[PDB]
């Protein structure tokens, strides 16, 4: 119901619970032709521009951090278990909102809320339409990887020896290769990766055991959010909104 | 895994996402006999006392508020649709925490976090064990009711005429009675109610179409929460904890 692609900027954002898609503040109109190549008609009022090719597909290897999640005692040889993060991003898109046309339902519920300021009613309004609406957002396909290690010396030895094998191929690729090496001769190590948004075939780093072309970019990360009270225009519900916003 | 009744005070509380039960900070021990009548052995360190009989089972009728959720235009006769809230509470319990014995895993992950202060590591620690632990909490069985009305004059007419019929029976009971009256002669009104925690047979207000005796009180509402950094004792991770706590 009332859901399109790019997409989630329309429905707003609840800020205390970090939930998106709640209520509809503007109207998805198809008058303007804000088209994107190889994608259908988009709602009006939003401006979307892909990331530069320099940062279109980029993989970051976060610093090796101990494994605290699965650790829930000091040992010199044994870990100190380590985990690694390898986050690549492909088909990334910026989305702005210039300039939006307001909906009738949201402005009407404002009107019935502007004329008389009430406590429980404003609280329920916040619980429905959230408390803020998003301005800029970053969509795309993100492959997040986590690597489990037994000790602290093992991932350092792999780090240095792989630094010597490379110095044509990156770290995680040959890492998975020598992982397939122990599958031939047997050690007890597992690698986990999950993707938010299916990844295109334009980038090699995110290919999966097939491949995909022009996938639907999912909401990766947030940028700049703007509150909802500054849109009501009358102070009697400005101070009531930002006042009832601090209770919980 | 590592879950008992009363219960959730042990696992902590994530504060930005309002999620409970994440990681284990203390140890559930059964040495002390903090027993409650008609309930098994409870973990040590917590003190639980039932609410007074005056507030043991209490039903509040919130002020009639317009129906904004289903409204997503001005009309004089028609609504302005209204909804009502009827929240009763039974088998309520206070829980405190005096005095708790710490776990080995949480103090160990602290130790490996106290000795060296790191950014990503402290962030992941917060994402696991939350950011705060709860001190006082209110459990019980809560019946929340919401009533849907078409107009603004209809629930006022029902309010006054029911005030005249009563002045032996409350509002919602005879309300449901005359609701069954229209089921005999036909209008298009529905009443919704949901319960968090099954309700005992000690109170009549929360009985359901059978009855239940001594149900397990669920976590109703929160009271006083205490942060987790003030428990690490060393400032090098105090300022690192409360500093990495403000980024997101
Ligand atoms: C009412 C509410 O949620 N206010 C929050 C505030 O607590 C937080 O520090 C800030 C950071 O983005 O965002 C806003
Ligand atoms: C019942 C409902 O929500 N209808 C909405 C309408 O209010 C909105 O103007 C339109 C454009 O987004 O989409 C549909
Ligand atoms: C880091 C964090 O979540 N801090 C929150 C703060 O934003 C909020 O105003 C306060 C109210 O309980 O609780 C704490
Ligand atoms: C693997 C694991 O979590 N074991 C825990 C232990 O650490 C804790 O001391 C005990 C008492 O709560 O419960 C169990």
Residue numbers in the entry:
A (entry chain A), B (entry chain A): 718 to 789, 793 to 887, 897 to 915, 920 to 942, 944 to 982
Pull verbatim passages from the article behind this deposition.
Our focus here is on a PLP especially identified as being involved in neurodevelopment, astrotacin-2 (ASTN-2). ASTN-1 and ASTN-2 have been shown to interact directly with each other in vitro in a calcium-independent way with multiple regions of each protein apparently contributing to their interface. Both ASTN-1 and ASTN-2 are integral membrane proteins in which a large C-terminal domain (extracellular for ASTN-1, endosome luminal for ASTN-2) is complemented by an N-terminal cytosolic domain suspended between two transmembrane α-helices. Thus, the endosomal regions of ASTN-2 comprise a smaller N-terminal domain and a larger C-terminal domain whose structure we report here and which we refer to as its endodomain. We describe its unique combination of a canonical MACPF/CDC domain with a minimal epidermal growth factor (EGF)-like repeat (EGF-4), a previously unobserved type of fibronectin type III (Fn(III)) domain in which an additional two β-strands are folded across the core, and an annexin-like domain.
The N-terminus of the endodomain structure is formed by the canonical MACPF domain consisting of a central, broken, antiparallel four-stranded β-sheet that possesses a distinctive central approximately 90° bend. The most distinctive features of MACPF/CDC domains are two loops containing α-helices which link the core domain β-strands and which undergo refolding in pore-forming family members to generate a partial or complete β-barrel inserted in the membrane. In ASTN-2, the first such loop (loop 1, linking strands β1–β3 and β4–β5), comprises 19 residues and contains a single-turn 310-helix (η1) and which packs against the Fn(III) domain interface (see below; see electronic supplementary material, figure S5 for sequence alignment and secondary structure). The movement of ASTN-2 through the endolysosomal system suggests that its activity might be regulated by pH. We have determined structures of the endodomain at pH 7.5 and pH 5 and of the MACPF/CDC domain alone at pH 4, and find the regions of ASTN-2 resolved to be remarkably insensitive to acidification. In an attempt to investigate the effect of reduced pH on the ASTN-2 structure, we obtained crystals of constructs consisting of EGF-3 to the C-terminus (residues 649–1288) at pH 5 and of EGF-3 plus the MACPF domain at pH 4 (residues 649–984), though in neither case was EGF-3 resolved in the resulting structures. For crystallization of ASTN-2649-984, the protein was concentrated to 15 mg ml−1 and crystallized in 0.1 M citric buffer, pH 4.0–4.5, 20% PEG 1000. The crystal structure of the MACPF domain C-terminus at pH 5 and of the MACPF domain alone at pH 4 were solved by molecular replacement using copy A of the structure solved at pH 7.5 in PHASER and refinement was carried out in PHENIX. The conformations of the lower pH forms of ASTN-2 are very similar to the equivalent regions of the neutral pH structure (RMSDs 0.23 Å (pH 5) and 1.52 Å (pH 4)).
